[PDB]
Amino acid sequence: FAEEDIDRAIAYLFPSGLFEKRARPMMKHPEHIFPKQRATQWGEDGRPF
């Protein structure tokens, strides 16, 4: 089972006819959906890396 099959399965099981496709149901890998964020720029002692 692949990402392409996932999108096809979700489209059948949750039919949405919204014109904007960002607003449609999605079951994507967390990397695609969650914005990758800059991590902590300093350690426990507080010295920037």
């Binding site: 720029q41 300093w42 002692d45 507080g46 010295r47 920037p48």
Partner: protein
């Protein structure tokens, strides 16, 4: 346990020159690097006259004897701060020496800010950097003037935050708010290169001494 931590942190303060910074420089060494050369008399600041040896045909000369005394104090202070694992930030807006100063900070293991200084960087740090950002414990101003011939904003902003400042102050600079002023030439490449090496050798010695001090005291605990 508690005795060892007290020994590591309290013993260095019982010696006048714990890190032997006196040997790094000499009046002759400073004179070779043209550290006694100042701006013309017209550019002179009123609070720099104590440090000026005289006026050699319009060019103010900086007493290299006061420079040696002041540099000893400033290098000594910078070593204890580095010994205690404090954050040291090098600050300058001279673009000729921007790459040298950033390379020096990287060699020492410390930090450099040679770029445009944002208003509020120190007084409004938590907004600009994050909630629990740790500010620098010492700021070394290799140049205390910005490119419009005005005091660098971080001189006042470091005083507002009660951060000590070690700054090179040429005849046209204002040393009043510099905690440890070092009177000397700031324009010549050979003068700036000397100061960068001194601050880099000093910081590495202080960091190395702490490693050795911990191993000796740590080893004693089992032994």
């Amino acid at each position: 346990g508690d005795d060892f931590q007290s020994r590591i942190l309290d013993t260095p303060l019982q010696h006048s020159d714990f890190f032997n910074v006196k040997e790094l420089f000499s009046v002759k060494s400073l004179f070779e690097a043209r550290v006694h050369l100042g701006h013309k008399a017209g550019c002179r600041h009123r609070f720099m006259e104590p440090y000026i040896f005289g006026n050699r045909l319009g060019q103010d000369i900086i007493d290299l004897d006061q420079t040696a005394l002041n540099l000893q104090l400033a290098l000594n202070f910078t070593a204890h701060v580095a010994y205690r694992k404090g954050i040291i930030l090098f600050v300058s807006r001279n673009r000729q020496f921007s790459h040298l100063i950033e390379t020096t900070a990287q060699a020492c293991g410390e930090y450099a800010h040679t770029r445009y200084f944002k208003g509020g960087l120190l007084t409004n740090a938590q907004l600009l950097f994050g909630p629990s950002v740790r500010l620098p414990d010492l700021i070394i101003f290799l140049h205390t003037l910005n490119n419009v011939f005005e005091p660098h904003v971080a001189v006042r902003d470091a005083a507002k935050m009660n951060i000590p400042t070690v700054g090179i102050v040429d005849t046209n600079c204002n040393p009043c708010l510099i905690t440890y002023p070092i009177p000397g030439n700031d324009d010549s490449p050979q003068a700036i290169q000397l100061f960068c090496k001194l601050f880099r050798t000093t910081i590495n010695r202080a960091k190395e001494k702490r490693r050795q001090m911990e191993a000796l005291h740590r080893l004693q605990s089992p032994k």
